[model samples]
Target: SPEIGQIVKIVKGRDRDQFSVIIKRVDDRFVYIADGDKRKVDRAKRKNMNHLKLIDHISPEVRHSFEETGKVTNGKLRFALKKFLEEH
Candidate 1:
C-alpha cells in the first residue's frame, strides 16, 4: 500500500514525471497528492493510485508527523520532496 507520506512519481497525467507525496487516501483506488508548490495541502491533487509509480522512499518527518499528530503539514511535504529530489 502507498501509505501516507510515501513519495510517488506521476506516470499517467499532465504532471507526468513529477514527484509528490501522498497526503490522503480516499480508498485503495484513489489518493490525494501534494507537491507543496502548485498543489498545497488544502488543494491536493486527487489521483488514482494506478496513475502513480510508488517509490521506495518515504519521508520520515512526514510519516512521524502523521503518526504523532494524525496530520502532516504542507511545509513538511514540500521539504520531504525537496530532500528526496536532492538526494536522488
Candidate 2:
C-alpha cells in the first residue's frame, strides 16, 4: 500500500510520466498526489491509486514532517521525488 510520503509516477492524466508524492489517501481506490513545483501540495491532484506507479521508498522527509506538524511541505515532496528519481 502506498502511504503518505510515497513517491509515484503518474501513469494517467495530463501529469502522466511525471513523478509525484502521495500526500493523502481515499480508501483503496484513490490518493492525492503532488509534484511540488508543478503540482503544488495546496492543489494536490486526486488520482486513482491504480493509475500511480508507487515507488518503493517512502521518503522520511515528508513522513516525519507531516508526522510532527500534520502537514507536508512542498519542499519535502520535491526533495523526496527527486531523491528517489535520481537514486532509483
Candidate 3:
C-alpha cells in the first residue's frame, strides 16, 4: 500500500496525465489519491499504488489519534484534506 502522502505519477488514464499524491489506500492493490487535476468520483480504475511510480513527498505529520484514537478532530481533518493543495 502507498504510504499516506507519498507522491505518485500516473502511468495511464486521463488522470495519469498529471502528478498526484497518495491520500489513501483501499487495499494492497488499490489507492485513493488526489492531484491538482483529479476530479473523478469513481474510485475504481484509479491507479493502484503498486502500479504507480512512487515519486518523492514532503514529510507528513503523523497523528497518534489517527492511528490509536481512530478519530480526527474536525479542524485537523479539514486541515489535512486541504493540505494536498498547499505547498509546504
Candidate 4:
C-alpha cells in the first residue's frame, strides 16, 4: 500500500483539479480523504483509490502525528496542502 499522508490529486468530482491528503486506507481499494477545507478532517469522505493520483510528496508531520495520536487536524492538513502548492 502507498503510505498514509501521501498527497493525491482529485481527478474528478466537485473537487476536480484539487489536491487532498490520504487519511486512512479503506480496504485495498478505497481510502478516506480530506482537503482540510470543505472536506475537513472531521468531515472526510470515502473515495475510491482508483479515483486518485498519488503524488511523490508525503506529509511527514501529518502522518507521524496521526500515527502517534490516532487523530489529525484541519490545520495540519491545510498547512501541508499549502506547503505543497508553494513548492510545486
Candidate 5:
C-alpha cells in the first residue's frame, strides 16, 4: 500500500534509479510523484505503482500535513529527498 508522502525509487522509466515522493495515489495502479526539482508540486508525474520501488522512509511532516489538509509543501518534499540522499 503506497501512501501519500512515502518515498520511492523509479525502477523503470526515463527517470530510472531516481528518488521521488509519492504525492498522490490514483486508484490502486497509479500514483503521482514529485522531486521538487525536475518534478514540482504543480507539475507532478503520474507513474505506475508497479514501476516504483517503495522506500522504507516516509516524511512525517508531509504525511501529517497531507492527512490533515490534503496537501504538502514543495520545500518539505525537497528537503526530505535531499536528506535521504545525503544520509543513505
Candidate 6:
C-alpha cells in the first residue's frame, strides 16, 4: 500500500518531477502522485491510476487503505476515504 505524502518518481505525464507524493498506489508499477510545481502552474487536479508514477515508496501513513480501494465508485471504502480526505 502506498501512503499519502511519500515521495515518488514520475515516469510520465505533464509533471515528471522526482519529488512527487504517493497519494495512492495500484498494482506493482503504478501510483497516484502530485505533479509538483507543474500542477501548481497548470491548476489541475488528478485521479488515481489515471495519474501515476513508476517509482514510489510506502509512505508513513500505512493505515490508509489505498490498496483496498478497488474499482467500486461509491463503495464504503471510497466514501470513507473521500470523507477523510475532504478539507475540514
- In terms of TM-score, the best-performing candidate is 2
Please provide, for model 6 over 6-86, each residue's C-alpha lDDT reduced to its tens digit, 9 standing for 90 to 100.
Answer: 544554565554345445446644554443343431332343543454333433332244445522122332333333335
Estimate, for each residue in 17-73, the C-alpha lDDT of model 2 and write its tens digit. 888888888888989988788889889999988798977878899999889999888
TM-score of each: 0.91, 0.93, 0.53, 0.92, 0.90, 0.34
Backbone clashes (count) for model 2: 0
Candidate 3 wrongly placed segments (more than 4 Å): 36-45, 58-88
What's model 3's lDDT at 54?
73
Q: Encode model 1's per-residue lDDT on 1-83: one tens digit a residue.
A: 88889999999988899999998899999999997788888888999998999999999989998899998887898899999
lDDT of 3 by residue, 2-85 (tens): 676565667767666555555567788887665423343233245665558875553253244346554334344334445744
Task: Find the candidate with the highest lDDT and give its number.
Answer: 1
CA lDDT, every prediction? Answer: 0.91, 0.87, 0.53, 0.86, 0.89, 0.41
TM-score of 2: 0.93
Over 4 Å off in model 4, which ranges? none
Higher-scoring candidate on TM-score, 1 or 5: 1
Weakest ten-residue segment in model 3 by summed lDDT: 35-44
Local error of candidate 5 at 30, Å? 0.6
Q: Write the per-residue lDDT of candidate 5 for residues 1-88, one digit (tens) a residue.
A: 9988899999999999999999998898999999888889999999999999999998887798788988878888898898888878
Q: Which has the higher TM-score value, candidate number 4 or candidate number 5?
A: 4
